[PDB]
């Protein structure tokens, strides 16, 4: 229904940073004339809605490849109370951007001793 996102997670102890890798999306819904969308991904760690990143916009595709990694300065021991949000939006030059769908990861469930890379279905906000 809302597409899928492939991402990965890691933690860098040398800089005390969470690494969020945004790989690609697939089967995104079309939101623009011509049957396509202009997707990008907004990435942030709740409850800090202020520190925020966006991938580049990939215009007129429903299957964008991003290959962008973002870093969040957060102490390892405090990660547990955070929730990572990866939200795919349709870019618009002129107006407020419409959300397509999102995936959330409660950080207390992440095992940094094993692989984290995966495809996940986007959900409505
Ligand atoms: Pb658009």
From Swiss-Prot:
UniProt main location, coarse: membrane
Alphabetically ordered keywords of this record: Calcium, Cytoplasm, Cytoplasmic vesicle, Differentiation, Glycoprotein, Lipoprotein, Membrane, Metal-binding, Palmitate, Phosphoprotein, Repeat, Synapse, Transmembrane, Transmembrane helix
Modified residues (Phosphotyrosine): 89
UniProt subcellular location: Cytoplasmic vesicle, Secretory vesicle membrane; Cytoplasmic vesicle, Secretory vesicle, Synaptic vesicle membrane; Cytoplasmic vesicle, Secretory vesicle, Chromaffin granule membrane; Cytoplasm
Entry keyword Cell division: no
Residues noted as binding Ca(2+) 1 in the record, renumbered to the chain: 32, 38, 90-92
A GO BP entry: regulation of synaptic transmission, glutamatergic
PTM remark: Glycosylated.
GO CC annotation terms, alphabetical: axon; chromaffin granule membrane; cytoplasm; dense core granule; excitatory synapse; glutamatergic synapse; Golgi apparatus; hippocampal mossy fiber to CA3 synapse
Domain notes per entry: The first C2 domain mediates Ca(2+)-dependent phospholipid binding.
Name this protein carries in UniProt: Synaptotagmin-1
Portion held of the full protein: 141 to 265 of 421
């Amino acid at each position: 229904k809302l597409g899928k996102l492939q991402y990965s997670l890691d933690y860098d102890f040398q800089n005390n940073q969470l690494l969020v890798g945004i790989i690609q999306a697939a089967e995104l819904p079309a939101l623009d004339m011509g049957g396509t969308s202009d997707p990008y991904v907004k990435v942030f760690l709740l409850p800090d809605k202020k520190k925020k990143f966006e991938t580049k916009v990939h215009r007129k595709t429903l299957n964008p490849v991003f290959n962008e990694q973002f870093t969040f300065k957060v102490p390892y021991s405090e990660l547990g109370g955070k929730t990572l949000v990866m939200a795919v939006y349709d870019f618009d030059r002129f107006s407020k951007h419409d959300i397509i769908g999102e995936f959330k990861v409660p950080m207390n469930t992440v095992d940094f001793g094993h692989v984290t890379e995966e495809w996940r279905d986007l959900q409505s906000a």
